[PDB]
Design a protein around this ligand. Structure first.
Ligand SMILES: O=C(N[C@H](CO)[C@H](O)c1ccc([N+](=O)[O-])cc1)C(Cl)Cl
Lengths: 142, 117, 27, 110, 56, 150
RNA sequence: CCCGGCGAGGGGAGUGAAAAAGAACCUGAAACCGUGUACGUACAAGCAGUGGGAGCACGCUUAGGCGUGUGACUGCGUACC
RNA sequence: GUAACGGGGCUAAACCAUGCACCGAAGCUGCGGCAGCGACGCUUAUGCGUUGUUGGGUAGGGGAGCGUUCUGUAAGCCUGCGAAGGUGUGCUGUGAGGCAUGCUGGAGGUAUCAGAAGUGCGAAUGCUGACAUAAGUAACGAUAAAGCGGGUGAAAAGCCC
């Protein structure tokens, strides 16, 4: 017959904590991306957000391999004249460690209105804690 | 024997503006624009009868994968398991079973696990 | 008593003489 | 009890009369006139006669009580364009349209 | 100094979205003569602030 | 078309489409690209294909019982009413009459009856023999038609 | 007979089968210009369509998760000659 | 303006060698459907009916069709109980199409089979007429120069004193 479809005014979206300590950067960002999309729910539906909410603490303690802690560079332009600003991984951790996890998953999430909507459910902290204790998130080894 | 066009030409145009209902701006008002819009509607319509059959299968596969991994096997092994078990239930039906009867789907995972070992 | 106007909108004005006239090119 | 009055072939563009028509749409007729009286527009003078004509249509023919009326419909449509010529430079001639409007105002006690 | 394409009727509408007039909504009444009138202006009968100025 | 031979335009420089003639068939007034003449629409028929054709149709008339043979067919005074009476009596209404000689009384009496036509054997034609419900021939009429087609 | 500059233009009454046949008069299309409701739309980037496809509103689907509208999200997608 | 992995990202998610697994097209299979040709101890004017194979198309060639106007059948049927036209809606053909009746319109309307064409329009900087756009945008045509009081007057900067 016709196929099932998730309804945004029915779907459940649950809450999780994840420790990013010692975890390889993009080899974790993959599993966040996956779960924020709801790819793991059998009722996955490409146009609806069946994903889940994910807290991520200790973003300042996520690992990268090789020479990437010092050599890996993040670029952005300001729409001006010279524009091209530039800063290393180590510098990013220093300035604002949350950005590294956030930049990573964002580039792995679908780009578009829904895409931008899934990202909203990622709540990365730098410290070892969060204010979302009322949301009763359960621990996830991912 | 002079033949006037008035009645027939209007009828031919009105058919097209009728096919163009709902379209934006000139595409629903102006015959010259509408006629191009309606054809290209047809070109895409033809095409997406073929595309539709690609999109839905990708969906079914993606859903079976989720539910298969829920019972601790990947899509690729699960389907192979069913084939060597000589189960032939297709993925439209399996994706349906994956949603509405998780217990029957688990039973198909064992069936496919037995054969695969 | 509103009879149509003379209007005098006959438009034989087209077309007046038309030089570039103009840039020099290109030799 | 809808009651109509109209000024056909008003000499103003429909665009210009519409700005003023919009000020009184939906209003109590007593409140509408005051708005019109202190709107600094030629177009405020044209429609006001129509509204007043409409009010008088309501008293004399049937309706009546000035208290009950609201401007329940008002719409301003295009009349015919009068064609003229303006001489420009180099013997070139331009059309000018002296555009007109049909002003309609509807009043009702309900 | 010319359009390359004919602009749309919707865009025309948007452009006109600030053409709307404002009603005064602040006429006042002379305490002697009882006429409505614009704030800080005399009345049609030549009254202002209760006292007969002018005479007409 | 009545009008002048002058080009409207200067060929080049004006923004208009190039013109040669205010009588061009694309122009309002003075069109008509391939205008009509008086013409002769008449066609050849072989003598034999005409006679052969008359014979085929006449033979069908017999087979469909639409041909009526009589010894004589004439009328007394030239009164259409008199003919009308006769025709009803014979149970005929829409009918072609072919007689031995161009009988005049019969000819006069038939003129105002739309469904009746009178003809001498010499003046027959293919379409009349088809166009009426019944066809009446005199004995004399047969002998003349017979000789003619033979 | 009214509004109305002894105006224009309208509204009544009356003629008239019919006046939405009223001299800008048989019928009376569209581009174009309006008023009225239905739905949509102010974090969201491009031949404006089509394949999915949530609502919400109608015709009750006239007991049957049926038709019309509207259509958020989303996959494909550079007019015609 | 990162900018010479498409990108996020990868010490391996890189290369080499071996091995299984699945995804994948308008490929092939399946079921449903139409159409052209070819062979049938066939039917046997032939229609049939099973089997066989072919249906990407520019210039072009071959074959079938739809509609518009006019003459015949045509002093043939329908029509004030409402024609054409207009505009709505319904169903059906593989398509041009076709058929059906909601409201206007207010007189003409035409089966079937024949015949003859000023016979089908989106382009020709094609023609004529309406109507958009820019747009309520530019401009209001000697830098001689006006201010007040009356008056007339529906209303006065412009008119008369
Ligand atoms: O019309 C001219 N210029 C055309 C522009 O269409 C062309 O670009 C051109 C430019 C430079 C030139 N030159 O330098 O000799 C010649 C032609 C003249 Cl200057 Cl030749």
């Amino acid at each position: 017959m016709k196929t099932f479809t998730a309804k945004p005014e029915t779907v459940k979206r649950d809450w999780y904590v994840v420790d990013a300590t010692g975890k390889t950067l993009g080899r974790l960002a993959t599993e966040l991306a996956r779960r924020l999309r709801g790819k793991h729910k059998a009722e996955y539906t490409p146009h609806v957000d069946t994903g889940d909410y994910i807290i991520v603490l200790n973003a300042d303690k996520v690992a990268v391999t090789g020479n990437k802690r010092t050599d890996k560079v993040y670029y952005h332009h300001t729409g001006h004249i010279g524009g091209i600003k530039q800063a290393t991984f180590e510098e990013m951790i220093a300035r604002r460690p949350e950005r590294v996890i956030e930049i990573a998953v964002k580039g792995m999430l679908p780009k578009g209105p829904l895409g931008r909507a899934m990202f909203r459910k990622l709540k990365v902290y730098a410290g070892n804690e969060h204010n979302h204790a009322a949301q009763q998130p359960q621990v996830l080894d991912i | 024997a002079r033949v006037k066009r008035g009645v027939i030409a209007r009828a031919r145009h009105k058919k097209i503006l009728k096919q163009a209902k709902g379209y934006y701006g000139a595409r629903s008002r102006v015959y010259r624009v509408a006629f191009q819009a309606v054809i290209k509607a047809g070109q895409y319509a033809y095409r997406d009868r073929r595309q539709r059959k690609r999109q839905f299968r990708q969906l079914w596969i993606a859903r079976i994968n989720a539910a298969a991994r829920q019972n601790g096997i990947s899509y690729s092994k699960f389907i192979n398991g069913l084939k060597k078990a000589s189960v032939e239930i297709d993925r439209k039906i399996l994706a349906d079973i994956a949603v509405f009867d998780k217990v029957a789907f688990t039973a198909l995972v064992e069936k496919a696990k037995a054969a695969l070992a | 008593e509103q009879k149509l106007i003379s209007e005098e909108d006959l438009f034989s004005t087209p077309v007046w003489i038309s030089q570039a006239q103009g840039i020099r090119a290109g030799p | 009890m809808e009651t109509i009055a109209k000024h056909r072939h008003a000499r103003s563009s429909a665009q210009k009369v519409r700005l003023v028509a919009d000020l009184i749409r939906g209003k109590k007729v007593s409140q509408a006139l005051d708005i019109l009286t202190y709107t600094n527009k030629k177009a405020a003078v044209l429609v006001k006669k129509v509204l007043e004509s409409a009010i008088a249509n309501a008293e004399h023919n049937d309706g009546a009580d000035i208290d009950d009326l609201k401007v329940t419909k008002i719409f301003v449509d295009e009349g015919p364009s009068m064609k003229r010529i303006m001489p420009r430079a180099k013997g070139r001639a331009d059309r000018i349209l002296k555009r007109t409007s049909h002003i309609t105002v509807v009043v009702s006690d309900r | 100094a010319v359009q390359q394409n004919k602009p749309t009727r919707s865009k025309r509408g948007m452009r006109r979205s600030h053409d709307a007039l404002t009603a005064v909504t602040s006429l006042s009444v002379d305490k002697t003569s009882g006429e409505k009138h614009l704030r800080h202006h005399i009345t049609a009968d030549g009254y202002y602030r209760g006292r007969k100025v002018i005479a007409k | 078309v009545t009008g002048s031979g002058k080009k409207p335009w200067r060929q080049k420089g004006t923004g208009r489409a190039r013109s040669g003639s205010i009588k061009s068939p694309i122009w309002r007034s003075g069109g008509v690209t391939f205008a009509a003449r008086p013409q002769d629409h008449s066609q050849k028929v072989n003598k034999k294909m005409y006679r052969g054709a008359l014979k085929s149709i006449l033979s069908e008339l017999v087979r469909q019982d639409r041909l009526i043979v009589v010894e004589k067919f004439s009328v007394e005074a030239p009164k259409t009413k008199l003919l009308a009476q006769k025709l009803k009596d014979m149970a005929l209404e829409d009918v072609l009459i072919i007689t031995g000689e161009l009988d005049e009384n019969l000819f006069l009496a038939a003129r105002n009856l739309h469904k009746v036509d009178v003809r001498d054997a010499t003046g027959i034609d293919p379409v009349s023999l088809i166009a009426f419900d019944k066809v009446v021939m005199t004995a004399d009429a047969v002998k003349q038609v017979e000789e003619m087609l033979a």
